[PDB]
Design a binder for this molecule. Structure first.
Ligand SMILES: *[C@@H]1O[C@H](CO)[C@@H](O[C@@H]2O[C@H](CO)[C@@H](O[C@@H]3O[C@H](CO[C@H]4O[C@H](CO)[C@@H](O)[C@H](O)[C@@H]4O)[C@@H](O)[C@H](O[C@H]4O[C@H](CO)[C@@H](O)[C@H](O)[C@@H]4O)[C@@H]3O)[C@H](O)[C@H]2NC(C)=O)[C@H](O)[C@H]1NC(C)=O
Length: 318
């Protein structure tokens, strides 16, 4: 099915994600700060350009990645390979980690905090820590199939007694109507991630949750892009990220569409920025350069595809 155009204001776009989806949220937020012009959210991700000049495992497992060059590159690329970093001073940025995350980790997120500290006033950056939470998406309900917030295992979505989706949306957008406490009003559309909407490393189908208010075209909506993490693509866990992460109940009472782009497991070995070659068996978003030297720059194929999806959705603005 073709990705529809909706009555969404192009000035109301943001993105967030977990894991490699968190990394990608920041890559989009930085490289395309003009497109994601409200802000972005990072759950258990890491520094922009973290893995370009140091090996990816140094950007994981609660290690201490360097941000010297990554920060320098942001300064250097501003206005060319990425949108003006001045934009970032005018963005709401949400950050979250579990204190017991040993997959990415507080130390990694601390480095992202420091990096962004060079481009956005602390007042606009919220960095929340849930004590005891492991690498997992934090929600405050028992989604079907959820793993314990104390055990990092598939589907990496938990009841951590913390509404992470709500927190991120409220930090990015400000005051929101109370989340829907009943059945959702909308549907979960599928669309073809093909042509300009698709790319290497991406599934051929994406999804989006569309509240009844946004479907009719009679109401101007906003757009939030939510990016699953590694081992969280549709191929791995089906619709569990779409359904169990808690974005939809907020979208539903706040005239918001939630777009859910899908990556896919990729067992082909590719040259990456640093450390030689690597396949992408876990279906992560590209934060290491699997599909291009420009993965976190304007033109990066996955970012270009997601931005394409965004432009299509907002093309229906009335
Ligand atoms: C990211 O975080 C930063 C830091 O908190 C935010 O930036 C501040 O934003 C507020 C509100 O927009 C600014 O407040 C305005 O300050 C003006 C004076 O600015 C002078 O001084 C600052 C340094 O203190 C210089 O940077 C600036 O160039 C000026 O020299 C006031 O004149 C404003 O008041 C007038 O406008 C308001 C609104 O219309 C009216 O209500 C008033 O009556 C009056 O007419 C206002 O108080 C503040 O200056 C900003 N500080 C910074 C960092 O420069 C970002 O907004 C935030 N990102 C976002 C947008 O979310």
């Amino acid at each position: 099915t073709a990705l529809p155009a909706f009555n969404v204001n192009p000035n109301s776009v943001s993105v967030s994600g977990l894991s490699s989806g968190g990394y990608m949220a920041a890559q989009l937020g930085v490289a395309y700060s003009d497109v994601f012009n409200v802000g972005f959210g990072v759950f258990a991700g890491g520094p922009y350009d973290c893995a370009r000049n140091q090996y990816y495992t140094s950007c994981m497992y609660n290690g201490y990645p360097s941000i010297t060059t990554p920060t320098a590159n942001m300064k250097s690329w501003s206005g060319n390979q990425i949108a003006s970093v001045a934009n970032l001073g005018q963005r709401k940025i949400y950050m979250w980690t579990g204190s017991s995350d040993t997959t990415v980790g507080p130390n990694v997120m601390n480095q992202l905090k420091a990096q962004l500290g060079n481009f956005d006033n602390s007042a606009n950056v919220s960095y929340v820590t849930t004590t005891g939470a492991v690498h997992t998406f934090p929600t405050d309900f028992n989604g079907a199939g959820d793993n314990s917030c104390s055990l990092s295992t598939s589907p990496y979505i938990s009841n951590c007694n913390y509404d992470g989706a709500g927190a991120a949306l409220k930090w990015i957008y400000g005051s929101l109507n109370a989340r829907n406490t009943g059945t959702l009003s909308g549907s979960v559309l599928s669309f073809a991630q093909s042509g300009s909407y698709g790319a290497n490393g991406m599934d051929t189908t994406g999804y989006l949750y569309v509240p009844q208010s946004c479907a009719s075209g009679a109401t101007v909506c906003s757009l939030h892009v939510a990016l699953h993490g590694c081992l969280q693509s549709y191929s791995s866990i089906g619709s569990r990220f779409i359904q169990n992460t808690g974005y939809n109940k907020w979208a539903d009472t706040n005239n918001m569409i939630i777009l859910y782009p899908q990556a896919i497991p990729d067992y082909t070995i590719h040259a990456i920025w640093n450390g030689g070659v690597l396949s992408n068996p876990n279906g992560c978003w590209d934060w290491v350069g699997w599909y291009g030297s420009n993965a976190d720059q304007i033109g990066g194929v996955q970012m270009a595809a997601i931005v394409g999806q965004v432009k299509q959705i907002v093309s229906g603005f009335q």
